[PDB]
Amino acid sequence: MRVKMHVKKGDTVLVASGKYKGRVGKVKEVLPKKYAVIVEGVNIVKKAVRVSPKYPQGGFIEKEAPLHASKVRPICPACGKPTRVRKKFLENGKKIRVCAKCGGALDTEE
Amino acid sequence: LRPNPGANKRRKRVGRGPGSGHGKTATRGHKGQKSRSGGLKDPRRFEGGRSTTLMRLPKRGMQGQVPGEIKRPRYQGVNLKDLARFEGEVTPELLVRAGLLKKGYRLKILGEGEAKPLKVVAHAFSKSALEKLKAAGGEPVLLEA
RNA sequence: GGUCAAGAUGGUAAGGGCCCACGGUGGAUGCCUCGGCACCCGAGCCGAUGAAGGACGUGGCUACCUGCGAUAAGCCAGGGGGAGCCGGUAGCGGGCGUGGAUCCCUGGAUGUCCGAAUGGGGGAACCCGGCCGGCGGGAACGCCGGUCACCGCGCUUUUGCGCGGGGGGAACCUGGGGAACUGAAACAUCUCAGUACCCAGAGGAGAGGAAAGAGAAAUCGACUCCCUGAGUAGCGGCGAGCGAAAGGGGACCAGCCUAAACCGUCCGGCUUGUCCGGGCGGGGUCGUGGGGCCCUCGGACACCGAAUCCCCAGCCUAGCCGAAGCUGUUGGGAAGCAGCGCCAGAGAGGGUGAAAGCCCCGUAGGCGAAAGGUGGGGGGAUAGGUGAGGGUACCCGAGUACCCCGUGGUUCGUGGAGCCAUGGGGGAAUCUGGGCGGACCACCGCCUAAGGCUAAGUACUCCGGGUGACCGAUAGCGCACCAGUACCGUGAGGGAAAGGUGAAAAGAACCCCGGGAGGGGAGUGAAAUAGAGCCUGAAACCGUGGGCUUACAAGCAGUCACGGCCCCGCAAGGGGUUGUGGCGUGCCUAUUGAAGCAUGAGCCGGCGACUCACGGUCGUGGGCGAGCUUAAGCCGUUGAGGCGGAGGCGUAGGGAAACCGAGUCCGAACAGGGCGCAAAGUCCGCGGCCGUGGACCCGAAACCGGGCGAGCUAGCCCUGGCC
RNA sequence: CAGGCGGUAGGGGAGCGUUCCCGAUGCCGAUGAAGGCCGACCCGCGAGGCGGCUGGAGGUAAGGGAAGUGCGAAUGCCGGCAUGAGUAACGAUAAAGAGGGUGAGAAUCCCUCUCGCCGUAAGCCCAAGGGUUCCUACGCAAUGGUCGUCAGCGUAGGGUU
RNA sequence: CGGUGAAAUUGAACUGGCCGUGAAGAUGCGGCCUACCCGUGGCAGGACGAAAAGACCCCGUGGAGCUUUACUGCAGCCUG
């Protein structure tokens, strides 16, 4: 939780929570880790405006706070994140490797 | 985690304010705050001057010497010596240079109990010294500059 | 049952008094911080390439806090970097980006107008002008532009071309000039003090810095700062007081130079021969020679104070990794209780809905890294310039040394008063020279003056980092965040307050009285007596209800007693409430003396005053009797203590001293006083305690320094008007 | 058994909380840190436990060490909150009364009609100095010394060449 | 009556007269005489009324402003 981070759009687990049921992290800041797991919001029973239906009450409430979420999940769930061994000419690949592994290859899924 | 100061040591009198119930500390106004009053001594100072004088140490700073360091044949022979040769040089341990008013200056013959001299060359031998030095059995000497 | 005479008691509050319940205004406040403050290390120069420091601008849509300035939420290039950003605004309305977008750094570009300002003026932040370029309606106008003080400074006297400075800066710093208080319980010498303050100026640190020194031993050897040197040596209405210096311990250790006629060279000289003037030099004194003549000479180790250059350039800010748990479980929560499985050259800490080594943290673990901006090291090279022997008539570091008085320094206040230092008048010596040790004279000794340069060790704190038997929002910087701004003053100048809703915004659709606020519901949620000034949220004061109590009463208060109520009560009885009675001058300060009519006192709350550093000094708790250790060098998450033996206290003292010495000065006196008598202290601490320091705390007339104002007021000057 | 025990100045002794330092964090704790609110067990007291309510997280000592500390009280310091008081006061004795209007409400706004006081000023005018505001449109919880649907008040927009 | 809504001083006070008394001019202590609960519009006597820690003073080896041929110097003038 700093100028540096955890997972990004990613897809991860909820340990100390109410859901645990991991899923799509719609957006995650740089400093306040502020990340939305699309896993628990509300309605803000909207303005009474025609902003929302003239008869409103916003629906998708999803600002995800706490940072006990168990980011990253290869064939393994709760795991920290490795770093590199480069291996290839100019190779950062700070992919995530521990027990199972996941790096969010630019392919099949984030 | 236990050895509290034995007997009394710890704060003995940092007595705060003036009295459990009451308080005020001293006399009457004559000794208020900015009241560090007639200090050390009023009429006592009158005394202080009270008298001509016969001891005058004039406009200067460079006196000579004739090294008056009180040394004792008694400490010597009772139990810290070598009955013939010790010399100013060997007197460090000697408590007749290991104090303060002339450490390195001159060791005199506090000739006392029994004989009363010095059997080691040097400087400072009471006359009584010269004599019981000669009796005790000693080779005293005295060269200059 | 009715009539009358008599007596005794009862309830009936407009309000008020003690008690209990339940509110409100007020913020104590417990804790809690992106905020101080304290110490230590790191760091230490800004500016005309017109800076520090501000005026007016720009952000599609912005008063403001921000960053840029007219190419203005920024353009350029390189260093860094993982995938999100269009600063604090989240909202509107639109976006850029894994063909390194946000952003961290280093060097880039215009870089508005003011501000040293300088092209000129000017109430700065705004109006003027002269030169070449440009565009426009051409000339006139008017913009971008490049343009044009002043200073002194050296160069081609003609470039007046080509430089310099100036302008800053919290504290440290050098010199310039330089004060009353208070003390001396008055106070004129004296004192604070060469302190405060005005100034000028070099810095990043200057200061001082190789000896006409010390000091007297046939000794030392730059300068600076620390400990010690004695607070003695001493300076003095010898009074308050003030107070050294060599040495020793320590730290830090380069030394280097120029006119100094003589050389010759030379150009100018005057005027010519043989004087002076100024350039090159050898000479260019380190602890003494230098030059010129004669002879012995001589044919590779030394670097600067940046001489200087190349580097591992230390960093600057971006870097990187990086140790091990889940199941359960009481919970709105768990990181918690419980189960088993886990890490560790890294159990420093914070952060993840209540207290984790194994969850968040690029931390302690260790390692990391760059082509810019800075150098000591280690080494090189660059190396100016140093680096021989005697002989001989001498000429060759300052224009004043020196001596009279008039003065400064210095531990020196006038004195027998020295040395350096200068304001007056005098007024010279080249190493047989000349000041210096002792006023001065005779000695020995000392050093080599009247020029020049700089490093290194103590100071200082703007700025950065870190640590705190250093602070919690009235203490801390006043200042924890749109406080040096609000606001008072003419200016100078003074100089607040206000920190927290909650775990996360889910912070309130919607219905209902109402103009609105605001008020009842629904949803929030774990709570909303957590609801927007909204945590914890007490005292004071005002309020709604309930209990007792009250209209023949004289009393701070009260309060001892008891009786009537009502209360928990098993009783014992315990509560609150009081009518009857007994006895009762309120507290603080300063008083012979107080109820005070003497005083302080409006009520609540938070602040609110005998300390610290040394000297000492007496105690007494503790180590050895000789006992103890500063300044430092060194090891030091914890940083671990160790060593450092210049000393000061003891260890006989007696004296004005010479000295003598446990003895002793008087003295010619065997008479007294200081003893001898150890009857060891010496050190660390804790503490009663003075002396200096503001030393229980706030309190005055005022004296002194530097500035601030004639839109204050009186005057005087200039210039219109009105009677 | 003494034997005594009013007693400021003042001197001696002995305890008390109080926020920190070790706290050799022991931990205690969301079945509450803490402060708070109330109470007929502890203390010779300064204080203590303990019980009950609040209250959201701390807090801390067994033994000892370190101190900005314990306060009516100083016409105190800073902030509240009271008091005469719902009396004194509204800024000029240059007076006003009506009708209709607009409004959630109009003594206190708008028109219009009666009426008094200025007029040599309560005239206009330039200038100074103020620097918003002026206007037009909405609004009034603050502000006018109550009003107030009025404004020189608040919000926005336009306004002097 | 209605809109409004302050200001010093003050322990708190529930505060009669007396004759007395007391630090010597008292509601508040003694003995006693009257008098119930409350408030408004007034009247000024006390509560030494408020006001300002007396400018009357004294006192403080206090301050400050003239002064004078008190004390010492500074200035400027005169002058070997």
Compute CA distances B82 → A6, A43, B37, B79, B137, whole Å: 85, 106, 59, 9, 12
Contact indicator for A81, A94 with CB cutoff of 8 Å: yes
Kindly report the bases of strand D lying within 7 A of a protein C-beta atom.
8-15, 22-24, 62-66, 69-70, 73
Sign of CA dihedral B24, B29, B35, B40: negative
| Beta pairing, strands B69-71 & A11-14 | unpaired
Contacts of B92 (CB under 8 A, 6+ apart): B98
Give me the residues paired with residue A69 across strands.
A14
CA distance readout (Å), A23 to A16, B130, B137: 15, 111, 110
Rounded to 5°, the CA angle A45-A48-A54 comes to 115
For the stretch B60-68, contacts whose Cβ atoms lie closer than 8 Å and that sit 24 or more positions apart, written own/partner, are B65/B105, B66/B106, B67/B102, B67/B105, B67/B106, B67/B123, B67/B124, B68/B102, B68/B105, B68/B106, B68/B108, B68/B124
CB-strand contact B35/D, under 7 Å: no
Q: What is the resolution of this structure in A?
A: 4.7
Q: In whole angstroms, what is the distance from residue B13 CA to residue B123 CA?
A: 53
List the structure tokens of A69: 């979420």
Q: How far apart are CA A43 and CA A67, in angstroms?
A: 23
Distance (Å, whole) CA B15 – CA B118: 57
DSSP A87-105: -SSS-----EESSSEE---
- Give a three-class secondary structure readout of B9-42: CCCCCCCCCCCCCCCCCCCCHHHCCCCCCCCCCH
B79 contact to strand D (CB, 7 A limit): no
Q: Using the 8-state DSSP alphabet, how is residue A14 labeled?
A: E
Alpha helices in B3-142 (DSSP H): 42-49, 73-79, 87-90, 127-136
Amino acid in the structure at residue B67: P
C-beta of residue B99 within 8 angstroms of C-beta of residue B93: no
The amino acid that residue A96 corresponds to is I
Lookup: tokens for A64: 């995800």
**CA–C1' B59–C439 (A):** 13
In the structure, how far is the CA atom of residue A93 from the C1' atom of nucleotide C15, in angstroms? 89
List b or e across B6-33, with b for residues whose CB sees 16 or more CB atoms inside 10 angstroms.
Answer: eeeeeeeeeeeeeeeeeeeeeeeeeeee
Rounded to 5 degrees, what are φ and ψ at B44? -60, -40
Q: Which helix (H) or strand (E) holds A27?
A: strand A27-28
CA distances from B39 to A39, B42, B114, B127 (A): 83, 8, 52, 50
**Residue at minimal CA–C1' distance from C504?**
A65
B111 burial (CB, 10 Å; 0-12 / 13-18 / 19+) is buried
CA atoms of A95 and A80, how far apart (whole Å): 11
Separation between Cα atoms, residue A104 and residue A107, nearest integer Å:
8
Tokens of B24: 């005020």
B22 touches strand D (CB under 7 A): yes
Gap between the Cα atoms of B138 and B119, Å rounded: 3
Instruction: Read off the tokens for B121.
Output: 């060359």
Distance of CA B6 to the CA centre of its chain: 33
Interatomic CA distance for residues B68 and B65, integer angstroms: 9
